[PDB]
Design an enzyme around this catalytic site. Structure first.
Site, PDB file in Angstrom:
ATOM      1  N   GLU A   1       0.793  -1.229   0.000  1.00 41.65           N
ATOM      2  CA  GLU A   1       0.000   0.000   0.000  1.00 41.65           C
ATOM      3  C   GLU A   1       0.831   1.288   0.000  1.00 41.65           C
ATOM      4  OE1 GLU A   1      -3.219  -0.110   2.755  1.00 41.65           O
ATOM      5  OE2 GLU A   1      -3.940  -2.055   2.037  1.00 41.65           O
TER       6      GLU A   1
ATOM      7  N   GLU B   1      -4.725  -8.660  -0.476  1.00 44.28           N
ATOM      8  CA  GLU B   1      -5.206  -8.345   0.865  1.00 44.28           C
ATOM      9  C   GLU B   1      -6.563  -7.664   0.800  1.00 44.28           C
ATOM     10  OE1 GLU B   1      -2.755  -5.877   3.616  1.00 44.28           O
ATOM     11  OE2 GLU B   1      -4.686  -5.243   4.451  1.00 44.28           O
TER      12      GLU B   1
HETATM   13 NA    NA Z   1      -3.253 -10.325   3.117  1.00 44.46          NA
END
Ligand code: NA
Ligand SMILES: [F-]
Ligand SMILES: [F-]
Ligand code: NA
Ligand code: NA
Ligand code: NA
Ligand code: NA
Ligand code: NA
Ligand code: NA
Ligand code: NA
Length: 398
Positions: free
Chosen positions: A137, A236
């Site tokens: 991220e 994720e």
């Molecule tokens: Na994950």
């Protein structure tokens, strides 16, 4: 309802699997042996996960904490991949532009060695690490390491070829946001287009990962990435929130819709939850599977690594979502998510012409977890009731 027409001759992505995260530092404890078996076995009341994501601690003296659960997953045939949140503290600087940290360009070679050395350590521990990513991220990095989309492309083009101990995964965007999104200054799909558009970056990037936080169905289609010849993993998410207990129903049905959308609209080869064991995860803290976990299991137990997604009428009635996969034993697996409040009869047909020799259903709903039954069939087709707010997986022998 339109008949769901399935065509084994029209193929999309190869499935790499389904999984979740293990993070002892942040979860507060590792999985126990019982929980490892519950997650990575594919037997009775086991989740059948086939991918494990692990943490790359900035401090190599802590890498050992990732090992026991990785070894267990690998022994049960799962792919293991790893993601970093921050460089070693000696390589990272404070970021004055919205992140907590930033990696200076002068430290890129050392950072690639950090990632390469994590891969080598895992291998020495008996885990052939499938891949390591550039950054978790980089576009939602207020508490970790921000990278611009130029920076990750520079790293991939000019430094990531020195990561030889494992495959290289792209930076993992927060939500796969459209490139022109007004609320994302420099992120989302731009991490990926810039790799596709740079010959050296593309050559040094083996697969792509993205997260799905707030990702709309209308953002999942990405034609250039879906046609580039390399897998896209959803690495994720938790949906629809972390605030609800994972047995909350019908809320948990959103998990099945999200998997379906990633599979059929995003052509994702993998779908990986956040923490495996958590109040809001597929495994509850008491070690039992949650409703959200049974939603995952309707896919993970039956759509196995190496299976190929095939054509099937995707939305035969509105908010009934259908996907189909073939395996190398020539079975076809059909997953039908009825997200409506109405039960009806749905017909299915092999447009590719194969005669059916058996159909078994596993179904999860408000009152059922992987409930098993035999389904009648005739010639190239079969029909079944799809109860309101339910997920039905049909295993079809041809
Ligand atoms: Na994950
Ligand atoms: F490479
Ligand atoms: F797509
Ligand atoms: Na394929
Ligand atoms: Na680690
Ligand atoms: Na493995
Ligand atoms: Na980290
Ligand atoms: Na520094
Ligand atoms: Na360096
Ligand atoms: Na609910």
């Amino acid at each position: 309802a339109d008949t769901v027409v399935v065509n084994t001759g029209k193929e999309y992505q190869t499935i790499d699997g389904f999984g979740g995260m293990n993070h002892p530092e942040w979860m507060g404890s590792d999985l126990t042996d019982a929980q490892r078996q519950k997650a990575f076995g594919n037997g009775e009341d086991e989740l059948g996960l086939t991918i494990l994501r692990i943490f790359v601690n900035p401090d190599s003296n802590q890498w050992n904490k990732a090992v026991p659960t990785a070894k267990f997953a690998a022994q049960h045939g799962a792919k293991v991949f790893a993601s970093p949140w921050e460089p070693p503290s000696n390589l990272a600087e404070s970021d004055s532009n919205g992140g907590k940290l930033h990696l200076p360009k002068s430290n890129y070679t050392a950072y690639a060695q950090h990632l390469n050395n994590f891969g080598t350590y895992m291998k020495n521990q008996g885990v052939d690490l499938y891949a390591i990513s550039v950054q978790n991220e980089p576009d939602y990095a207020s508490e970790w390491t921000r990278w611009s989309t130029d920076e990750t492309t520079d790293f991939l083009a000019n430094y990531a070829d020195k990561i030889t101990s494992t495959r290289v995964m792209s930076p993992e965007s927060f939500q796969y946001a459209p490139e022109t999104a007004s609320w994302v200054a420099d992120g989302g799909k731009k991490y990926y287009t810039k790799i596709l558009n740079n010959q050296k970056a593309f050559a040094n990037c083996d697969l792509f990962g993205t997260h799905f936080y707030g990702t709309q169905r209308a953002w999942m289609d990405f034609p250039a990435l879906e046609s580039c010849g390399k897998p896209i993993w959803m690495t994720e998410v938790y949906v629809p929130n972390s605030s609800s207990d994972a047995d909350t129903w019908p809320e948990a049905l959103d998990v099945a819709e999200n998997i379906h959308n990633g599979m059929t609209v995003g052509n994702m080869s993998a779908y990986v939850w956040w923490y495996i064991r958590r109040s809001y995860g597929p495994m509850k803290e008491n070690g039992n599977i949650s409703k959200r976990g049974y939603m995952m299991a309707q896919y993970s137990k039956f759509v196995r690594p190496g299976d190929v997604r095939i054509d099937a009428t995707e939305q035969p009635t509105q908010n009934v979502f259908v996907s189909a996969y073939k395996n190398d034993a020539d079975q076809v697996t059909i997953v039908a998510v009825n997200k409506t409040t109405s039960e009806y009869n749905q017909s299915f047909s092999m447009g590719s012409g194969e005669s059916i020799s058996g159909v078994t259903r596993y179904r999860s709903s408000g009152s059922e977890n992987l409930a098993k039954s035999e389904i009648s069939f005739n010639g190239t087709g079969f029909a079944a009731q799809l109860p309101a707010q339910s997920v039905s997986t049909f295993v079809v022998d041809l």
